[PDB]
């Protein structure tokens, strides 16, 4: 035990020394000459309402028109952003839902929560009905985030301090990502889709390879549990939000923190993080009933969304970036552009 | 003006009607969150991985959820119960040991931001076992709680069956601990409803119904601008 602890301490010291040595300068100095983004006064183009309880997840589709939103009332609504008309309202077996997903092809959707089961629903099928295709079981904790690698693979994260990759046809886990010591509460797929990143409740984030099944890198993280995570459009970086009321940016190659977004006024932790199409505008949601837009390079508050009477829960920009969506506990989903 | 948008509008109207009807049907029931330790006997108070109970009293339905499948870490998933009407918190009063853990759990529940507006209903279970332990006198509550030695019984208080003064004193000290924890940070938004119960007690449902009625009355007072 003593030898293993000494070896771990030596390895951690070596990693910290290498991390500190490889530091040319702060990101602010390099981006000092960059022109400021300017006041981003976004406007609530549309409001969707309809939901009866707190909205807990939201995910834009590839078509950029249909967005699926889950609420703890037991409903999964597939809104059409342009005409604000409901398309499919799926009742849920378990009223407690904390995650939602949309397939890239648009055929399937996924939901999960305290039931510890990743339910899958087929939208486009014969007879024109929404029915549960496959139910994924095996997690010992609450499901927090599920994403579609493809129409046949789903990557999920649970409160069992674990993540899993599933084959829909097989119904069994093909790869188990373990190593976290806290509740993994977020999971964002990389654009290459051969890698992803997961932040856990132990104030840390880990990069994972789906094929290898072993963690590639682990980051120091914030001072508190991580609530949100998002992947930079380039794919070589990712943002992270935690309850320390601060946001951070990490680079896979640098293997260290790059920029910190914080303000003395805000003392409320993050709940949802998203990156714009260009990656210049990092949108974050705060539990003090609003959202803030930050400059990725300049690290300044460009604007505020506001307009929500309760804590925001889900944030997301469309693939083409033509709009953003914010879903809160108000049961109102507001589209800003 | 084309048939596609007309069909979409009809679909939206039908879905909205169904959602409104489902919400109207669901809003009738009152939702409760059962929380307690392993030794508190949480299962038998009212008589996958999350268990549900549904009982009707006075032609009103109560649906109570208890969570056992989580991995001993409630700082994150407890936020899902932000909309429940009440948290039925059960605590083993018989065991002098581990009672500080129950007090700390009650304080953590009370001081949570997302549970601040939520009201709790306290159930001091295994009352008869505590009475038997007090009568035996082998275990002294003074050792675990040194403040009990200077605690006199309230003058206005009086037990119904005329219990032994030692039992009444111990019960009132135990209840006073929880009410002192509650009143420190209650601020008027929520108020605890302490109670004493046994495994054989049958009127727990009526107590829960009355406490929920009081909570809803307070909610209506705060909602109907009656201050």
């Amino acid at each position: 035990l003593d030898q293993l602890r000494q070896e771990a301490e030596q390895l951690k010291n070596q990693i910290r020394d290498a991390r500190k040595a490889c530091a040319d300068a702060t990101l602010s100095q390099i981006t000092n000459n960059i022109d400021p983004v300017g006041r981003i006064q976004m406007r609530t183009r549309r409001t969707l309402r309809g939901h009866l309880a707190k909205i807990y997840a939201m995910h834009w589709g590839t078509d950029s028109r249909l967005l699926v939103s889950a609420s703890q009332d037991g409903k999964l609504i597939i809104w059409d952003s342009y005409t604000t008309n409901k398309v499919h309202a799926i009742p849920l077996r378990s009223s407690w839902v904390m995650t939602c997903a949309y397939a890239p092809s648009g055929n399937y959707v996924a939901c999960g929560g305290l039931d510890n089961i990743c339910s899958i629903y087929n939208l486009k099928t014969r007879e024109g009905n929404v029915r549960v295709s496959r139910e994924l079981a095996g997690h010992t904790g609450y499901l927090s985030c599920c994403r579609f690698l493809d129409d046949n693979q789903i990557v999920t994260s649970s409160g069992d301090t674990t993540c899993a990759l599933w084959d829909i046809e097989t119904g069994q886990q093909t790869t188990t990502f373990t190593g976290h010591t806290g509740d993994v509460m977020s999971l964002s797929l990389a654009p290459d889709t051969r890698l992803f990143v997961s932040g856990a409740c132990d104030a840390s984030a880990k990069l994972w390879d789906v094929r290898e099944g072993m963690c590639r890198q682990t980051f120091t993280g914030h001072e508190s549990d991580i609530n949100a995570i998002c992947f930079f459009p380039n794919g070589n970086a990712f943002a992270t939000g935690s309850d320390d009321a601060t946001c951070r940016l990490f680079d896979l190659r640098a293997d260290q923190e790059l920029m910190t977004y914080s303000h003395d006024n805000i003392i409320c932790g993050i709940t949802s993080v998203s990156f714009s199409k260009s990656g210049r505008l990092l949108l974050a949601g705060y539990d003090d009933f609003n959202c803030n837009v930050w400059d990725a390079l300049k690290a300044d508050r460009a604007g505020v969304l506001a307009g929500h009477d309760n804590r925001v829960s889900c944030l997301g920009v469309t693939d083409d970036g033509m709009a953003v969506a914010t879903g809160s506990w108000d049961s109102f989903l507001k589209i800003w552009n | 003006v084309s048939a596609e948008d007309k069909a979409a509008a009809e679909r939206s109207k039908m879905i909205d009607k169904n959602l409104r009807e489902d919400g109207e049907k669901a809003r009738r029931t009152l939702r409760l969150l059962l929380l307690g330790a392993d030794n508190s006997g949480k299962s038998t108070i009212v008589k996958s991985g999350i268990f549900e109970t549904k009982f009707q009293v006075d032609k009103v339905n109560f649906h109570m959820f208890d969570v056992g499948g989580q991995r001993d870490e409630r700082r994150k998933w407890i936020q899902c119960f932000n909309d429940v009407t009440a948290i039925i918190f059960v605590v083993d009063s018989s065991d002098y040991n581990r009672l500080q853990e129950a007090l700390n759990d009650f304080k953590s529940i009370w001081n949570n931001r997302w549970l601040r507006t939520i009201s709790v209903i306290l159930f001091l279970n295994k009352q008869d076992l505590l009475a038997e332990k007090v009568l035996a006198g082998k275990s002294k509550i003074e050792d675990y709680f040194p403040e009990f030695a200077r605690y006199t019984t309230p003058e206005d208080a009086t037990p119904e069956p005329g219990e032994d003064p030692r039992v009444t004193r111990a019960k009132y000290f135990i209840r006073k601990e929880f009410v002192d924890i509650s009143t420190a940070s209650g601020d008027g938004r929520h108020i605890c409803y302490p109670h004493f119960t046994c495994a054989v007690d049958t009127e727990n449902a009526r107590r829960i119904f009355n406490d929920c009625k009081d909570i809803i009355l307070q909610m209506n007072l705060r909602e109907y601008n009656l201050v």
Partner: nanobody
Amino acid sequence: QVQLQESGGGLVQPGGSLRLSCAASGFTFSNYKMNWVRQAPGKGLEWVSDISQSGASISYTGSVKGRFTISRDNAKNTLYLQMNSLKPEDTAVYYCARCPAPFTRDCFDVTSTTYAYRGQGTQVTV
């Protein structure tokens, strides 16, 4: 890495006194409420003492009341626990732990299995 390093502890004769001090690194010390946890052999984790952000509010366990003192130094990012009249039953591993969230009154999982925000602790045998 929100590291918490404890120091002190060891074999102490009954009736003795001892000071256990935990230093903190990686997080702002002042923001977080601090707690102490005991784990006796064949016993589970139990809360024993708590101190708030400013050091004004303070709470003990009834068993250890009148014999344990908790002190918090924001300047040195350290938390000390003085132990007087050490009883033979008070032999345990002490973990100096941090409240999960900053600027937060409630601390849910201070005493729980596999909690990340706590140190390795030090063993005091009496």
